[PDB]
Symmetry: C5
Amino acid sequence: VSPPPPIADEPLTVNTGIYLIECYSLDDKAETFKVNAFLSLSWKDRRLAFDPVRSGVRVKTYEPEAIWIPEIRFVNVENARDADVVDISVSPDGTVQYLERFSARVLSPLDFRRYPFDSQTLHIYLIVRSVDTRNIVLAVDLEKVGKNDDVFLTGWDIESFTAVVKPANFALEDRLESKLDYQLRISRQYFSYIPNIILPMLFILFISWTAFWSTSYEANVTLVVSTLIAHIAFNILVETNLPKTPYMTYTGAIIFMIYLFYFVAVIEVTVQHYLKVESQPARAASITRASRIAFPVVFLLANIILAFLFF
Amino acid sequence: VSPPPPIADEPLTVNTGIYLIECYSLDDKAETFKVNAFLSLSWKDRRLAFDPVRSGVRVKTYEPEAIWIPEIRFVNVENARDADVVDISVSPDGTVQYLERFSARVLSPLDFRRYPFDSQTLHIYLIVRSVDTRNIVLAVDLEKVGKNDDVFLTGWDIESFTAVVKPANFALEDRLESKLDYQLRISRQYFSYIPNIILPMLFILFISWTAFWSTSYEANVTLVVSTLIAHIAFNILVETNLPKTPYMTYTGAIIFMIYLFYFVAVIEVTVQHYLKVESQPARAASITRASRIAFPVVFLLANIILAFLFF
Amino acid sequence: VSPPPPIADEPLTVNTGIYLIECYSLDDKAETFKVNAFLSLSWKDRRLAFDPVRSGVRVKTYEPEAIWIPEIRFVNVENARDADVVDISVSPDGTVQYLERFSARVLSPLDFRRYPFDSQTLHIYLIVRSVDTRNIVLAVDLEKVGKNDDVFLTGWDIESFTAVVKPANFALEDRLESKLDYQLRISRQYFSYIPNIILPMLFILFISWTAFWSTSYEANVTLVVSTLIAHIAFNILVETNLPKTPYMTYTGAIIFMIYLFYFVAVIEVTVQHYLKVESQPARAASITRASRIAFPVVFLLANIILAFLFF
Amino acid sequence: VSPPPPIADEPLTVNTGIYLIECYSLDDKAETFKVNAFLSLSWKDRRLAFDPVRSGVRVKTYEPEAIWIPEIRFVNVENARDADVVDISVSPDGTVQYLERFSARVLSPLDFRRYPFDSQTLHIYLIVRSVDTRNIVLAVDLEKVGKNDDVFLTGWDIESFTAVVKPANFALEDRLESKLDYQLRISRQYFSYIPNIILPMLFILFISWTAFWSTSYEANVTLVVSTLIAHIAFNILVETNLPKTPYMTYTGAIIFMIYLFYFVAVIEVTVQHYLKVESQPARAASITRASRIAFPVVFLLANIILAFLFF
Amino acid sequence: VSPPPPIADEPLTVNTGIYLIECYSLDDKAETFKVNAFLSLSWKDRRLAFDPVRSGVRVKTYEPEAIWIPEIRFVNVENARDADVVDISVSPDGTVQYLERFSARVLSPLDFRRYPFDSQTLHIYLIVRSVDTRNIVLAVDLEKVGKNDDVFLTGWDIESFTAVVKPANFALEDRLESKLDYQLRISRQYFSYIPNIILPMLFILFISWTAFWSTSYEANVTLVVSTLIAHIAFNILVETNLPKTPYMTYTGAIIFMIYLFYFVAVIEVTVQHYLKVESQPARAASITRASRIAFPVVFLLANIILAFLFF
Ligand SMILES: [Cl-]
Ligand SMILES: [Cl-]
Ligand SMILES: [Cl-]
Ligand SMILES: [Cl-]
Ligand SMILES: [Cl-]
Ligand SMILES: [Cl-]
Ligand SMILES: [Cl-]
Ligand code: NA
Ligand code: NA
Ligand code: NA
Ligand code: NA
Ligand code: NA
Ligand code: NA
């Protein structure tokens, strides 16, 4: 059990395929997902060639230990995949058809810039390391790349599962490495974010703006401070669902901007009271009346600017 | 150790059975459940046939390694099941009776639309992949399908555990696949949701409506804003128990609608105060008196409409 | 390696014993506990009988693989126990003395009705399945049933660890099954619940009742609404430490009833205000004075009724 | 592979040693800690005697399976330790020097009475069970007992790692058991508790006492009720870090006592208002002035009494 | 299979290399990180030397079991690494080139003093224990030390991955131990802390300072007490992300100091009210006007002092 020797000096081509059975546990904080799939491998081993007329069989079945099998690994995994060999079939010319079913936890970075209206390209990198005897190169058998219809990733829509057919061949620790990129294109189901986070957050913000139709400082203080505390609750809830990013997320920007609106509303409420106490409610009245238009208008404009920058 | 050869060209029938011992960890967020069960398998292998007279024994016991056993797998599992072979019995005609006890974590999607008054059909898909020598087809031995009396799934009532006797035979990667659907019908024990979430949520909403029997704006602001914060606490509690769905759930709809009622109550309280300050308490009084009837009436009607759409 | 043949048609008796070493992780929500114990097994195998005079030894030690050992399993486990064989001793008559040390996660339902003043009977079900050659029956060797003094289950008092000596013999999938019930009787250490949940919950309720010695509606609204929010915090804390039950628990009933007391106190506060505004403080005064006695009296009586129904 | 026979009737002495490499995950709630250490064992097996002149080697190296090794276990573990044999060296006289590196999760009860100014003695119990052929006794090789300088247990100071050299030899299930006690003495780093829990809790309590310099009932109600809610938040935070104890802890006692101070402050605020309303502010003034001294004095005295009882 | 004998009395040099493939799960509380890397080993075994002319091959491939391999371990790991041997190549002189891919959870203490503007040096300690036959010493092959470009540690910037080429050779349990230090230099991405924790915390503090432009005690009490509760929420959130340290962290110091600012603001608000009630609003006015400058000035100065001490 050693690699098949070359006829000339050509590398050994291992044709690959991944057929997704299950996709689950897409952890946004960890930037990981779990996969249960079929991994098909195919290569020619002339040492295994036979005459079907003399042997009586058109195909030969082998045990993994009985023959040479290329050491194929996943790059972006936590631990080595848990694999169970399904079948090893050898045709008369010595063409081997290997099939295994595996489970793995894949590390794939996510771009949260447009969260929760984001799309991701999850990667599964297949790799083989060349041996001293000969160089091993990877290929894609497009006929053996797919996913079943039942593949459901909770909170996501699956668009496509394709493979970049040209491998990335590079040298690592004085040996050739042949890498294939299997890309799973997904898009977030943003629906739930609207009644659970977005609209509740807007309702409390609009409730704080009723202080612009009130001269009662004590009630105005209760209105703006209480809704601010409710906004803090939603901010904390959102940041518990997401990892910490070295950039601003769309939701993060809106959440942050709303703090400025609460801050300016506290300033308005304070100014209005100060003037009323200073026996100038006429000045206070004009500021409060302006705020009634200014706050929703500036909020609508700032959100248009934010949506423009992010989308 | 190779599959039993056919007498004519007929496929090999592997009769199956699942007897549930334990059902636990039904995770709503993950849409998974854990199962501990017996898996029985039966097929004829004429190569194992014997005369019971000359052998002296009526039934022969074999070790898994000693004989050919079909590679049976579960489709909707996280990882391959943890199995322990209990018994392998062979009758004189060569009929094999295999029994194993296994544990597995099953992926089964849940429909939360009617939550917490929802019913679910959990699936366990048994599968076999055919070999080059012969095609393997699955069957259900109804006598070997069941569950013990002690099977308890916390927070759920188990209705039935049946099997769709006709297998789904299809081609996958140029080989026949034979799939069986084992269905576990369950209904959610909604009891606890009434004193823990539903009634507390209604009590705080009804407490906010006492503002319609008060002219004190500052007290009215405290009443409606405080109860709103308590409503947000319950909303967050509910959404931590459930996954994010691309549809509205029954509880989700009620929770969302109640925000509109708090919003309109803030509008009422603001309007009532504005008019009182504007020296028109007669206009304010008629709006407040109307609200006393309008708010409970509209709440009762909206809930009838919601219950109608969902059930 | 096959089961010992019968002398007459009698079943094979496997004497059992469980000696608890560690008891930990009693999860109320999951209704599971972890156990680390010794499992002793004893049965006669005449094929292993020897003359101690000819052999020179009065006991023979065997490796598990060298001899037939009954396939003993636990019924109510998540996964098969992790076992390490300690010793296998054979006496001249062929009596085998097997000892293993194991760890397992046991599924045992709990009755939360009297929580946190509840007692439980945890079960460990030992089982053996019969073979075609002969029927295997389980027995209890009371001398080999116990627990060490150091066995501590955090938040619980261990009363007894006994075994129901008569096995439950039944037919399952056309083979006899022999089941033994090992019962671990425990009682909850309710101490901590008094200073952590019960008294804090009563203090906030009594703080809300100070509104009956106040004519200040705005202060009364703050008192009752704030303490209600603190009561909601305790309700949520309690329901996070418990699973969802299709029945009321003692704590659950008290917690639920206290919502009614807060609701009626809001009604009182609203009524008192309304009258004091309709220029009838004399009517308001008599209602408030009555409430001072009515609220603690009805609370004390309702709690006596609740404690009576639950204990 | 059986135990070495005795020269006379003496028991077999297995010299032991534990050298700590890593100490981590001291879980207070679970009362467990994780350990990564070296376990050294030494015993004489005269059957392994060799002539170094004939063998050519002065010390023979063996594989665990090749020779008899005593079945040494830990008593207070969740599951059996994960061990990797480092070396097995045999000298000509048949003296075996065994070394393994292991990882285990140890169950060791903690005394929370003085929390967070508590010290603990973590135990690691080594045990061996005797065989029918001969009795096995444990011993401590003090030269092979220690810990590396890098051993850090987060939130704790490690004082000493010693062994009680005299084993506890007792009969269990009709065989001798030899137990050794390895004691890891640790003291909690209380530092963090002062700026994170203790001082924030005292600041909010002192903020509630500003109500004794205020005649404004509505403001006084806000002061005491709000700080009480903040106290409940800290109580919940503390009880999430600790297990439920059938005794009072130091922190638990202080936290509980502070509820009584908030309760009495609510009584004071209510009394002060009632008298002011009853046109007797002179009586109210003397009670409020007394409270200014009484509350801090009684708080300081009660804490001295508590610290005395606990330390 | 025993270690290669020395030519003279020199120790056996095992050249090492670590090439990082994945870096994930840097847990601040646990002070652990997960690593997936290549571990290369190289040493001379003259017993494996061959003539390439006679053998026909320039390199020989071996199975791990077929040859002697040094027992290399990681010091600061939870459990032994999960390793898969990739290749074992032997050159004519007997120079062995070993390569494995492993995954491990590394224990590496973190200095939180400057959090969240902190930098760390994560350590991976490689170790070998010497045998009776000969001493084994570790070395660094700098050509086989690195990391791939795709190596991403969420919330951190990776600066360098180097090795301290001189090993720490010391005696442990009467045998030589050879230790190598692989250092992974990382710096925290502080960006997210600014819009998520720092600015929200400053906004609420600045909102409390609006009480210095208000004579309304009841509104002032609401302002300062409400923002204090919001500050407590952020303190709790921060201490849930960090472990308990026996020193002050930068964030911990700022958070603690802000409590003093809220405390003094409550004192100011109380003093201002007391004087107004005592018919001296002129004294109150001068204190309030001074506070408007004093609070931001002292806050800015105290923060300059804190930043100076910490950086
Ligand atoms: Cl892999
Ligand atoms: Cl499976
Ligand atoms: Cl088991
Ligand atoms: Cl029966
Ligand atoms: Cl039977
Ligand atoms: Cl162990
Ligand atoms: Cl290791
Ligand atoms: Na191979
Ligand atoms: Na087989
Ligand atoms: Na056996
Ligand atoms: Na051995
Ligand atoms: Na208030
Ligand atoms: Na080896």
